[PDB]
Structures are given as C-alpha cells and as structure tokens.
Amino acid sequence: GSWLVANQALLLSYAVNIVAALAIIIVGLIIARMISNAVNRLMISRKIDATVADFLSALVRYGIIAFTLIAALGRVGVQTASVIAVLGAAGLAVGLALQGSLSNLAAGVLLVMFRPFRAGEYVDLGGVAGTVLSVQIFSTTMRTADGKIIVIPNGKIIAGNIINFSREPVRRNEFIIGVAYDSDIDQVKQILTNIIQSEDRILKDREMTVRLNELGASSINFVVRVWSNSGDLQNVYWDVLERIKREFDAAGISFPYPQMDVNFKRV
Amino acid sequence: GSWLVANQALLLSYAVNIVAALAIIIVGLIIARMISNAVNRLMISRKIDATVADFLSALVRYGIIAFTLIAALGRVGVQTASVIAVLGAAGLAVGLALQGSLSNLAAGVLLVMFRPFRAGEYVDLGGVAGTVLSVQIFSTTMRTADGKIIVIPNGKIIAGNIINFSREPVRRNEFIIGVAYDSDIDQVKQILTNIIQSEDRILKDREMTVRLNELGASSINFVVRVWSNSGDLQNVYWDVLERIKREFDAAGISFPYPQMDVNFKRV
Amino acid sequence: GSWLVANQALLLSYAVNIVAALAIIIVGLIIARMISNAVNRLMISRKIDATVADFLSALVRYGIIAFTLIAALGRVGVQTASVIAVLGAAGLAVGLALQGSLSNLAAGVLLVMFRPFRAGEYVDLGGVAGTVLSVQIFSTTMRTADGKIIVIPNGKIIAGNIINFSREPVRRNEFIIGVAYDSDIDQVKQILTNIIQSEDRILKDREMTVRLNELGASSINFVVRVWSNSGDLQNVYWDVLERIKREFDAAGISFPYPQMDVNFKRV
Amino acid sequence: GSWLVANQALLLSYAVNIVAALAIIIVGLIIARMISNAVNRLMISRKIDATVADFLSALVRYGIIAFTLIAALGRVGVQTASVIAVLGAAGLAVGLALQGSLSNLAAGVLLVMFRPFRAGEYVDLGGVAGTVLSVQIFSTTMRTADGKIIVIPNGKIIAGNIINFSREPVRRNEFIIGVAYDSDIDQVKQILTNIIQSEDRILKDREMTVRLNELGASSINFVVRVWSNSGDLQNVYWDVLERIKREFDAAGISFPYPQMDVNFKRV
Amino acid sequence: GSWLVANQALLLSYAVNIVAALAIIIVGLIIARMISNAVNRLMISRKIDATVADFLSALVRYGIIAFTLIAALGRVGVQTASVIAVLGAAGLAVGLALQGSLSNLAAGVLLVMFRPFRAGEYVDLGGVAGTVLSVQIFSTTMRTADGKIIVIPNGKIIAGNIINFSREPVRRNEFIIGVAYDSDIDQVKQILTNIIQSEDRILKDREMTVRLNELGASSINFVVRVWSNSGDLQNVYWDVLERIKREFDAAGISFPYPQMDVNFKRV
Amino acid sequence: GSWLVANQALLLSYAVNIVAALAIIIVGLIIARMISNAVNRLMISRKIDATVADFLSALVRYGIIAFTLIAALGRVGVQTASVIAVLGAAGLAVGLALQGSLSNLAAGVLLVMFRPFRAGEYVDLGGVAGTVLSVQIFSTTMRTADGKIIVIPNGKIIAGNIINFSREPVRRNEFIIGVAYDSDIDQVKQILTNIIQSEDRILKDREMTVRLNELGASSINFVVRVWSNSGDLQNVYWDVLERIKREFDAAGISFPYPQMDVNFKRV
Amino acid sequence: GSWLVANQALLLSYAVNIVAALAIIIVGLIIARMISNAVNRLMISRKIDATVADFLSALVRYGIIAFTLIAALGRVGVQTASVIAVLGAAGLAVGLALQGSLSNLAAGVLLVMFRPFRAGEYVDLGGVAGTVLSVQIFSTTMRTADGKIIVIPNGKIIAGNIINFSREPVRRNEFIIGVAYDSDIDQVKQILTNIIQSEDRILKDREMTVRLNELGASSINFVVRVWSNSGDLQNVYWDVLERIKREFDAAGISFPYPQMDVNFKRV
Numbered sequence A, B, C, D, E, F, G: 001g002s003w004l005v006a007n008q009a010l011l012l013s014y015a016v017n018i019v020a021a022l023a024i025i026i027v028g029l030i031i032a033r034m035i036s037n038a039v040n041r042l043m044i045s046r047k048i049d050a051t052v053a054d055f056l057s058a059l060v061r062y063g064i065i066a067f068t069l070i071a072a073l074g075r076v077g078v079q080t081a082s083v084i085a086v087l088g089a090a091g092l093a094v095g096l097a098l099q100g101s102l103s104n105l106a107a108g109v110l111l112v113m114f115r116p117f118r119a120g121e122y123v124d125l126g127g128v129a130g131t132v133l134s135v136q137i138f139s140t141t142m143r144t145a146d147g148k149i150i151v152i153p154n155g156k157i158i159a160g161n162i163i164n165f166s167r168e169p170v171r172r173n174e175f176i177i178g179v180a181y182d183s184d185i186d187q188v189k190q191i192l193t194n195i196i197q198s199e200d201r202i203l204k205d206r207e208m209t210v211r212l213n214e215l216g217a218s219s220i221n222f223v224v225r226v227w228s229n230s231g232d233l234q235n236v237y238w239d240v241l242e243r244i245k246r247e248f249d250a251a252g253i254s255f256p257y258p259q260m261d262v263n264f265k266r267v
C-alpha cells in the first residue's frame, strides 16, 4: 500500500541499487568503448594488422561490457556466480590455449636474462644449427650454414639442449682413418703424427691422439683427435685429410675397399 | 496467524523476492530467445552450416536460461553453489576441449602480428614445404612443389621450426662428388674450380669451397659448396652437375661403382 | 521455556527454513525424476542403447538429487562447502575425462565452419589417405584406396596436417629414371623430352623438367617432373614409364643393375 | 557476570550453534557408517574384491566424516576455508589421477553411442588388428589373427585411427610382380590379365589394373590391383599368386634374383 | 575509557574470540601430536621404514598445526585467505606429483575389479612378456621366460595393450618355409600337408593352411598356419620344423641360400 | 562535526581495526624475520648451500610479510581478493613447477614402503642396468656393470618397468647356435644335450630345451634354453659356448659363414 | 530531501568509502611508481637488459595499479569478482608459461642441495657428455670432449639419467676381439691373458675376463673385460689393442675379413 513506504526505510536500499546498477552500466559502457579505442590506437601504432587489431579491441570491449553487466546483475541482487564460473573457465580456456604461446615469451625472457647465445653465435638448438641473427621475444631467428633462415620458438629452445660452438675458442677434430690390416701400425702412427705435428694450427699443448681405435670388418681404424681453434677447425680437417690421402699412397699404405673372402664351390 | 503479518515487516523481503525471481525469469527467457535469434542471424550471415548454427544458437539459449534459472534459485534463497561448481567445470571442460582449437587462433594472431612468412613465400613448416597461399586465422594453406595443398594448423607451426627459404635472396648448393681413390686430387680440384668459376650465377664474393671432405668406403668425396641466388639455386645444381659428369669423363676421372675386394679361397 | 518464544521473533526464521528445506526436496526429487524421464525419452528417441541411456538418465537423476540435497543442507544452515568442493572436482574429473571426447566435437565443428575437405574429396590426414565419405560431428569416415573404412577422430585431424589432393585440379608426377653412367646424357634427355611432349595429358604451360638430378652409386638418376590433371596423374605415370622402358631398350640405353667392382686376390 | 545474560539475547545464537554442531556430527557419523555399509553392500553384490571394496567404502566413510567435521567447525564459527582449499585440491588430485581412467569410460560411451565396430567386426586399432569380441565400458577385447587376446583401452582407440575391414564388403589386393628387364612387357601384361580375368572372385565391374609401376634396381615391378569381396581377399591373393608363379615359368618369364654387374680388375 | 565497556556489549564478542582462538590451538596442537603418534604407530605396524614414517607423521603434524593456526588467525579476525590460496596450491602440487603414483593405484584397482590376467597367466604387457606372479596394488610382478622379474607399474599396463596368451587354450603357429623357385609347388604343398596332418597335436577342426604366400627375392615362401593348444604350441613348431627340414632334403627340395645373378665384365 | 562521535558508537569499530591492522603487521614482521632466521638455521644445520639457504629463507620472509600485509589490508576493509587470486596462482605456478620434483619424492616414498629393490640388488630400470647402491628419497643411485654411477630419479623408476634380476635365484640362458643345413639334426641335438647335461651348474629339474628353432637364411638355428642360478648364469653361458665351439669342430659340424648362391652370366 | 540526512547516520558509511577509495588510489599509484622504480633499480644493478628491465618494471607497475583499482572498485561497492577471476587466470597463464622456466630453477636448487656432479666432473646427461664447468641456477654449462660448450637446462637433467664417470675412480674396458673360426681358442686366450697381465695399469684385484663371448657370422668374438683407473682407461684400451694387433699377427692369429661362402652355378 501507500503507507508501506513510511514505516520501513530499508526500501531505500532497494532504490539506490537501481541507479547504482545504472552507474555500473553507463560508466562500464563508455569505458569499454574508450579502452577499446585506446587498445586499438596502441595496436595500429605498433603496425599490427587491422582485421586482428579490431578483433582484439572488440574482445576487450566485449569483456569489459561483460564485467559491468555481471556487476550490475550482482548489484541489483542477482546471484551471478554461475556465469562467473563459466567465463572464469573461459579465461582458463584461453590460458591453456596461450600456454604454448606464453611459454615462448618466458623462454625469450630467460634467453636474455642469462645468455646461452648472442647474435652471431653459432649454435645447434637440438638438431638444426646456425648463426643466431637475433633473439626476439617470441622466437629466435638463425641462419644455418646452408643459407636457410630458421625461426625457432624459444620454448623449443629452453626445453632442449643448447649446443653452442662459438663460446669456447678451441675445439677438436676427430679423424677415423681406415687402413688395411696388413699395414704396419707404427708406420701409420708415425706418418700421421708427422702430419698433425707439422700442421701449425693444431694446438700442441692439448692432447694429440694418434692411436689404434678399432679392428673394423675390412679395415683397421685409427682415431686422430687433434685440437684447433674453432675458426680453423674445418680447414684443419680438410688439410690434414688431404695430407693423409697423399702421404699414405706416397708411403704405400692402402685405404682398403670393403673386403670379402669368397669360398668357392663349383656345383 | 493473521496478526503475524502486522508486527514484523521483513516478510516484505520474502515477497519482493518472489516477483523478483519472476523478474529473473521473464527477462531471462525472452533474452535467451532473443540472443539465440541474433547469434543465429549473425551465423547464417557468415554462411555457416545451418545444422551447426542451430546447435550453437541453442547452446547459447540453453546457457542463458541456465544462468537466469540458477539466478532465480539464488534469488528466492536456494544455495545454488553446487550446480555452479558443476557448470563451471563444464565450462572448464569445453575450455580444455577448445585448447587445441584456440591455440591455432592465438598462433594465427601471432603469425600476422609478426610475419615469419607471407603469401607466396616458400617455407618448410617442420617437414612439409611449399609456397604459402594464404595464412588464415585458424590454419595456413600452402601449395607444395608436388602441387598438393597442405592446410597446416597454426599451432603446429608456432610450436615448431619455420624454415623459410624466400627471405634471404642467396642460398648454398652442396655437391658431394665421389671419385675414385686413384684419381689425382689436384686435377679434380682444378677441373671443379673451373666449373664453379665459369658458372656466372655462382656468387664469387661468397665462399667457393672445393675441398676434399671424406675418404669414403669405395669413393673419395669432394664437397663443393657454392652460393647462388635463391631462384637460380636448383638450375645451378643441375647445370654444375651435368658439367661435372661431362668434364670428368672428358678428363678421365671416373665416378666409382661400389668397390669390393674379393679374397678367393677354392674349397 | 514457553515464554522464550514471545520476546523474540527471529525464531520464525528458524521455522520457515525447515519447510523451505522440504521445499528444496519435494520439488527437487520430482524434478530429478521428471528430467530423468525426459532425458531418457530424448535418448531412446535418438535410438541410443538402453543400458547406457538408463545410466546417463540415472546420472542426471543422482546429480539433481545431489543439488537439491546440498541446497537443503545449506538452507537449514549446514556449511556445505566441503561436499561442494568435492563434486566440483568430480565435475572437473569428468571434464578432463571428456577432454579428448569434446576436442573431437570442437574439431568437427571447425571442419564444417571452414572446410578443408568435403564428402568425396581425396585427402591424407597425416598418414592414412582416402576419399572422405562423410564428416560426422565426432569422427570423419573415409574410404582408402584399398577399400578399407577408416574412422578418424576429428581431434587427430585438426591437430595434424590435412594433405588434400582433390582441391587443386593439377598435380605433378616425378619419375626418377636410373640409367648407366656410360649412356649419353643428351640422348637420354631428348628421348625423354620426346616422351613427355608427345603425351597430350601432360600440361605444357607448366614446367617440364628433364634434367640430371643425381650421380647414384651404380646408376645416374634423371628426374622427370611433369604436371598433369589430378585425375590423369597415375595413368600418366604408368604410360610415361612404360614408354620410357620401351624407348630406352629401343634406343639401346640400359637401366643398370646394382654394379659392383670386384678386385680379385687369389690367396 | 550473572546479569550479562539478561540484557542481550544474541547469546542464544552462541548456544544453538553448539547443539547444532552436535547435530552436524551425530547425523554425519551414522550416515558415514550407513553409506559406508551400503556402498560396500553394492560392491560385494557386483563381486568386487573385498580388500578393495573395504578400502573404497572406508574412503567414502573418511570423506563423509570429513564433510560433517568441517561443517561443524564452520557451524560453531571456525573459518574452515583452509582445509577446504586443501581437500578441494585433493579431489583435484584424484581427478587428474582418474583422468586416464575416466577417458576410457567416456570413449567406451562414445564407442556404443556411435559404433565404429561391433562384436565380430575385424578392425585394426592403430597397430594391432583382430576381431572384436566385446566392447566393454572401460576396454575393448579383441582376438587377433594369431589367437592372442588384446584388451585395448578405449581412450587409446578414440584417440587414434579405427581402421575397419568388415564394414565395406569389397576390398583390393595389390600384387607387385617383379620380372626381369629383358621380358616382354605386353606378354607379362596379357598373361597377367588372363589370370585376373579367369579368376571369378575378382570383381570385373571395379578397376582391374595391370600396369607397369616401377623400374626397380634388379627387377621391373608390375602392379596388379584387383578388387574382391572381403572374405575372398586372401584366397584370391594366394591363388592369383600361385597362378602367376606357374604361368610365368610356363611362359618363360623369369622372376629375377638380385642382379649385380661386376666390373673385373685383376690386381 | 572505563565507561566505554558499559554502554556496548559487542566487546564480549571481541573477548570470547580470544580464548576461542586459544581453543583452536590447545586442541589443535595436542591433536596434531596425537594423530602424529597414531599415524606413526600404524606405519611401523605395517613395517615401513622409520626415517620415512617419521617424515610422513611429521608432515601430518605440520599440516594439522597449520590448519589450527590458520583457523585461529581467522578466528580472531585475520583474513587468512592468502595463506589458504597458497597451501591449497601446495596440496595441488603434491596432487599433481602423486598423479603418476595414484594412477598406478587406480589401475591396480581396475586390474582386480575386472581381471585381464591372474597369477600364473602368461601375458605380454606391451613389450615384455611373462607369467604374472602377483598383481599387487601399485605394481604387477611377472617372471619372464628368461627368468627375470619385471615389476610393471599398473598405470603402464592399463594405458597399453594387454596381450594375453593363456586365456584362449588354442593358438596358431605360422611357419614361413622358403624353398627354391625351381621346386615343384604341388610337391611342397603335399609333403607339407602330410607333415601337418600326421602331427596329432595340430587341430584339424581348425584351418590348416599350406599355401604359397610370397615370391621372395631368392626364395619362394610358403606359409603354414596350423592351430594347436597353447601348451603344445612351441613343441609343435619345433617338431614340424625339424620334420620339414628332414622331409625336404629327403624329397630333394632345397632351402635356397641367398641367390645372386652375376653378370661378368672383364675390364 | 564534534557531536558526530557522541550519537553513534560503531565508529569504535573503525578505530580498533586501525591498531588491529598494526597488530597484524608488528606481529607479522617480527615473525617473518623470526621464521626466516629459524628456517635458515635449520638449513645450514643440514649443510645446504648458503646462497640458496638465504634465498629460500628470504622467500619465506617475503611470503609471510605478504600474508600479514594482505591480512592488514583486509582488516582495515580493503577487498584484497584480487591479490589473493594472483598469489594463489603463483603458489599454483610453483606447484606445477615442483610437480616433477615432488613426483620423485612420492616415488621414493613408494620405493621404500614396498621394495622392488634394495641396496645391492641388480636391476634394470627401463634401459640402464646395475646394482643399486642406495635408494635416496629423491633419486636412486646405482653402479652399472661398466663401473658408471647412474642417478635415476624415482619418478622415472615408478613410471616404468623395474626389471629385477637378483630376486629370483634362478634364471635362463638362451643360446642360438647356427649350424649348416647339411648337418645331421640328431647329431647336433645329442652333442648339445651331452654338453648341457655334463654341465653341473645347469639345473636339470627345470626345462632343458635343445630343439630346432629356425631355418635361417644361411644357417639353421638351434635354441638351447638352460636354467642356472643367477650367479652362475654368465659363466655357464661362456663355458657351454666354448664347449659347443670345441665339440662341434671336433664332431665335424660347421658353423656356416653367410652363404650366397651365385648364378654366373658371362656378358 | 534535505531532512533525509538527519534521521539516518549510515549515509556516513557511503561517504567515508569515497575518500577511502581515493585512499586506495593515491596510495596505490605512488607505490606502483615507487616499486616500479626500485624493481628497475635492482634490475640494472644486476646488469640486465634495459628494454626488458623497463618492461618487467612496467609489468609490476601495471599490476599494482590493477590491484589498487580493483580494490577501490570493491571499496565503493562494485562486485569485482569477475575481473578477479580473469586476472587470476592470467596469473595462472603466466604460471603455466613459467612452468618449464621454474622447473629449471627447482632442478638447479636440487643439483646443489645434493650434488650428482661438481665443476670439473665428467658426466653424460642423457646423451651429450662432458666436463661440467659450472652448475648455474637455471642451466648447467659443460665442455664436451670435442671442445663444444653445451648449456643444458637443469630440468632436462633432473628429468633424466645422470651418468657420472669421475665419481668412482675405477672403470672397465671391454674389448671385443674378432678372430677366425679356425684359430686355436686356448692360444687366443693365453696370448690375450699375457697382454692383460703384463699391463700394469690393469687392476688384477678386479675381474680379468678373457672368455669366448660370441660365435659371429664370419668371426668368433672374444670379450676382454679389464678394470683400470678412470684416468688410465682410454690409454689402456689403445695400448692393449695395439698389443693385440701386434701379438696376434706375430702369433699367426688372423683377424678375419667378412667371409662369404660362394656356391657357384654356371648358367
């Protein structure tokens, strides 16, 4: 009735909620537009594609209006915990979606906090190998020796071995020279030691191994482990190998073809 | 009794909730229909299949009616946190279901924020390789060299290496020429250097390697690493290889068949 | 005492809760039965197995009675957040169980929103390959070339490459013809070019490669890359290959058996 | 003091909570026992092992007493949200534990909602292949051709390809007949076409391919693709192959051994 | 002031909380000790290592004191939701840690609810194969044929195929007899059929295949598929194979060595 | 105004909160220091590295001050649920980080609750194999036969097969003796049975198999399965094998080299 | 109206919230700046890159302003649980992103709590092997024998085997000497035992095996297992192997080439 308003004053609390609910909305909407403008303005400023910038700004818009709408529903007195539990799980959905996306971000942060490599540092990121051109924040671009550009996601980097090459200035070449069984072991060892000692780029302060490593099927395999600076490594390999090939057939030592004893049976 | 209503006025709060609960429903239903219309209208406008558009609009319908029903139950005074905890986990279920679906969306956003490739850019997305036709938002369509169309999900792209080819204009061809052990190393090197120097598409400012790389089982393998523009790469390979094949059997150098020494035992 | 009821009137609030709790139950039970009927009725209407329809309708029954029971316990004043936190995690359990089940549903939605393939479109879904018969909502049935029916879950599809064949009408055949080293390169190239030019189904506006691709161990391998319509591809392969086999041993060119030089040592 | 009880009546609320807390316990305990009886009774009724039935009934017992204890603590006024957040995560622990267990349940539900196979339907569930004996709810038992019983969890089924065989009644046999290079191609094709046409179980309305598929290293390989009913497939393979073996060495065509040209060098 | 206590009586509520907080602690501590005793007593009673029993009882101690401390802090009025959210995630940490531990428990429950194998039942649990000695609750111990004891975690069992052998009493032996191309097919088939028919342990009611399965490179391979009881399987294989080896070189049929045609070129 | 304090007394509640907030802080800080001392003192007492002990004690410090600060903010009346939801997820972050760390702890608890192996028990933990030296709580140290020390994390143990060797005292040696096709089967079987019967360490109560297992390509392979105590296994293998090698070339039986029939064609 | 303020005094509570909300902001902002300064100052002090230090300090800034803004919204009376549930899931997103980043931190803590290796301790971390240079907190740098620097993330270490070499001072060399079948077994064993006994670096207190291990295809393989100190291991291998190669062709024992019996058929 008309007198019902006079006795009690808690009906005030029913009324202020109403305009308060409007005050959740008419502030929430113009903000949702406003932010959706600014987020767009700071998207195009970074030169990011317009069909995507519009969509992400619209996502922000459609999220802030959702916040203010659910807040107004809770303001008047609707128990909005249901929708809340749903879009919380939607945030969880996009979070587990962006798991593999943000893992690359965290790994890119780690790769500059501490630096397993820099721009211009030859590496092998678990397979592919090349000179890093630039460690970006979501990916690591590197030029392999074949001239290809490989864009590795940083999460695949930090989740695996980072086999650097250009950190230590000195590395090792390993030759496996297969000679014949009938060759004199001491002759091979001395005519190889002369090679690796007359080569000036091989470091003598390190270990210079020339020792019999394997009794192969057809051949007998000598290992030659010689250290050289990381820039002179491949040239040392090629030069020492050409010198082996020349000094052996000068000395009469024969690199054997795949041998095969043949027992003969005429039938 | 009849006098029980007179002393206390909090019974009002029991009453307004009732119509308020109706005001959760008769507004919630017509909205649930209304949105379920509009969501359908903006589904068919995008030419999306009707049996699926109807189902998704019905999902929105059956979700908004759930919100308003749980809200009315909370309005009258039912403690609806149980159902809330259930459909929150249902939202979580569809979220972890849409994890692999929305990861492709996030990756498609990243692939246009920063561009590891564009339409018409030959790439190799961890295995398969081809010219990208169009980077869509959920997938990346590319035409391989065999004429097949490969539709790669962007999450499989960003989660792996993006081996581009058409970014850097210059690449490297690597020949591995196997000649016989009895061939003169210097003759091979000079008759190969003449080939790679008389070829005008090979870039001379880069490194032109012709050096002995391996002592094979039957053969001795020379590596030839020569740089050329990324368009002239395969033609340079084919031409230099034909020229090798012709200049070697002109010069007498023999590409060896798989050799096999045979020790004979008549028994 | 008996006078204790007269001074205070909040004891009313203790009383209405009681029948209110009954009003949580006697409405919750008949609904739980009622829905459990209708859910069953709309399960058998879809011809779904009765021992499973009964179980799922009983699950709905045993869930709605759980909601109303916990709600009545919260109504009287029990703090039911414990059981709530438990069956919320049970909903989470079935959600993470239905993760791999609903991922197929989401992927089936995506496969008709945008269509990497239609019914009758030959494809290769990361391994297995065949003509799609029907893209259902949880799975994709396709008939391989061997006549087998392969029912691929859509989550395994969207999570991998979709190598289509019947989208682009033109594809490429790649022959690798191994001839002997002593054969004339120009003779082989011209007697192959005549073959691929006199074949009318090979498209001449495309690239018609006949160029020396590899110096094999025993053979020398010419690549022949010729484009043809996707229907005439296999027949072109077979015809061009028969023609190669006939024109070569007409022209004297020999396809070599695996050669092996044998150095002889009588011991 | 003694007068402190007279002025205020909210002390009543402190008192009723006490017996109310007892009313959380003396109802919670006898229920926890009671359910723990019934859950056991409906466990042994299904013939489930007693040392496990006792443990699961004790789990239910120790969970319901936990609910009522935490509820009594919240009743008196303890803020029990800590323990709540802990056993909620314990429910989450058992949920993520039962993830791989309930995924099989959901997949078993899907495998009878829609049926990629029935009892007695030869299939190949991503590797292993056999006749399904019975699709249970957690697993799928099938007898392979070697007589082994393979119990596949349904989550491993739905998560992979379901290569059926006994759905389509017609399938394809593919022979790869390697003959010698010196054999007449037309003779081979006609003496094979006569075989596959005089075989009555080969379906002639389908495609009957006999065409030259490969120029092998030693051999030349003809493909023979012939369709037959899925029951007569293996017998057709064996019969056509025996007939090939007999008609070829009747016709003089020779299946070649691995050929190897040998260039001889006496040294 | 001193009069401030007289007007208001809610200060009582500040006071009872204090001793109530003590009543959270002096009950919580002696329980935490008490349970930590009993949990230890029921750990040593099961003969579980003392350095671990002490640690787990101390974990229970340090957890119950945490509950009562946080509860007292919430009792006085501290908002303890922060620490709550932290040790809830700690419970989640140990839960995701015990994921792989409790999955074995759930699988061990399943392996006795329904039994894919019993003690003494030869099986192959995805690789390793042997006679199950005892299915414990966390693991499955089985003795392989080589006498090794293999303790398989039940989660690795239920997550993979369970290839039983000792369920069905009858199994199949598959011989692949490679004979020469020049051998009479009918002679081989009849002298094999006589073998598999004169063997009394081979079941004749089943299928007794002796049919030409493959045209090998050097040999021609006959398949012999014969069924026998699962105990007599290996002995049947060995006996039938010895009989094949004897009856063939009695009948003149020759098992061929790897043949190789050699085209000779003196150069 | 000045009279505003007189009418209402709830302003008291605004005031006590203030010093109460201080009572959240001046107790929270000195505790945070105090615990951060004791946690450090019980870290150095266990000889744990100081740069890490300081960091973990500082983590405890910076966490307890966070608790008391958020609690004071909630005390005065700030709604601190935002920060709470953030550091709850931070606790979740460290929990999912410590997932693989605490899984090893749980597995180490299981490996001493029930013992698949003890110190000095030769095992093979899914690959690597050796004698366990000590099962620690986070790892399992074992010395392989090559003298290497392998520190296996217990989660990698419990998550895989535990192939024990030193539990059962008796194991099986399996020889696969390849003899020539022209050798007498009965002679081989009897001259092998004499070997395995005259060897006293072979257990005769077990099964002593000497039966023809395979018709190899070049050889015919007899299996010899003989049981011996787990300590005498390798010595039995070596002795029986030396005896086979000696008694066969005493008896004239020849172990065949890889045979190869050569069909000759002079061209 | 103007009299509305006089009757009720709860309007005070509406007013103090307002400036209180300002007191959430004007304290929250200057702190957010202040911390964002100090966090930057303690970032540059550690020499961390400025473009990243600025971003992380801005993240802290934009997070603390978010806390105070949401707190002010909750202060005035907005129900801010929606945004809370969103940025809680954002914290969860960065947490699951930093999962693989912080797992390395936890593993680096474990690798110094207990030490499977120290700086200068040769190891093999599941594949790659080298001398550890320094165990950092996020990674483990080690120099392999080839001179490469390998930076292993500690999570890849603790998650796999840690095959140490330099813990135990004594290790085992295993030679597999393949001699001919016609060689005297006792001669080989004694001329090998003399070698391994006249070598002073081989430990005689350990086991010195020289026993016939395998009947190879072409060869007969003797195993020689001899223990030596971990520093003298490779030199012992090389010396004993050279001595074998010399003493055998001194004694007439022949290391056999791959033998092959050839049955001859002139056709």
Ligand SMILES: CCCCCCCC/C=C\CCCCCCCC(=O)OC[C@H](COP(=O)(O)OCC[N+](C)(C)C)OC(=O)CCCCCCC/C=C\CCCCCCCC
Residues within 6 Å of the ligand: C013, C014, C015, C017, C018, C021, C022, C066, C069, C070, C072, C073, C074, C075, C076, C077, C078, C083, D019, D020, D021, D023, D024, D027, D028, D031, D064, D067, D068
């Ligand atoms: C999946 C299914 C999960 C189920 C798990 C089973 C766990 C079993 C454990 C405990 C349940 C025992 C029930 C004990 C009943 C006494 C409850 C009591 O202690 O009451 C105290 C109240 C105090 O009132 P307050 O001032 O603090 O206001 C409260 C404020 N509020 C209005 C928050 C909204 O006193 C009152 O209100 C008036 C009290 C009137 C009590 C009447 C007796 C109960 C009658 C009907 C309810 C039937 C419940 C269904 C039981 C099913 C068991 C399976």
Ligand SMILES: CCCCCCCC/C=C\CCCCCCCC(=O)OC[C@H](COP(=O)(O)OCC[N+](C)(C)C)OC(=O)CCCCCCC/C=C\CCCCCCCC
Residues within 6 Å of the ligand: D013, D014, D015, D017, D018, D021, D022, D065, D066, D067, D069, D070, D072, D073, D074, D075, D076, D077, D078, D083, E020, E021, E023, E024, E027, E028, E031, E064, E067, E068, E071
């Ligand atoms: C898996 C299971 C996990 C369990 C973990 C075990 C952890 C054990 C830790 C602590 C237990 C200590 C119990 C101390 C009892 C005194 C409690 C107290 O401090 O109460 C103070 C109350 C204040 O009330 P308020 O005005 O602030 O309104 C409160 C508003 N509310 C109505 C929110 C709905 O004063 C009152 O009301 C009257 C106080 C009446 C106290 C009577 C003595 C207790 C009698 C029966 C309850 C027995 C509980 C079962 C114990 C199980 C131990 C294992």
Ligand SMILES: CCCCCCCC/C=C\CCCCCCCC(=O)OC[C@H](COP(=O)(O)OCC[N+](C)(C)C)OC(=O)CCCCCCC/C=C\CCCCCCCC
Residues within 6 Å of the ligand: F013, F014, F015, F017, F018, F021, F022, F065, F066, F069, F070, F072, F073, F074, F075, F076, F077, F078, F083, G019, G020, G021, G023, G024, G025, G027, G028, G031, G064, G067, G068, G071, G075
């Ligand atoms: C890891 C760490 C994370 C930390 C994140 C830092 C974010 C910083 C953001 C905001 C901090 C701003 C502090 C502003 C202080 C004014 C607070 C205020 O506006 O309060 C208004 C109240 C209204 O009262 P009410 O009727 O609504 O009852 C409330 C009911 N309740 C009893 C729920 C249980 O008025 C009152 O009660 C009396 C108000 C008296 C205010 C005295 C000034 C503050 C003094 C001491 C508190 C120190 C806090 C520590 C700050 C550390 C910053 C890092």
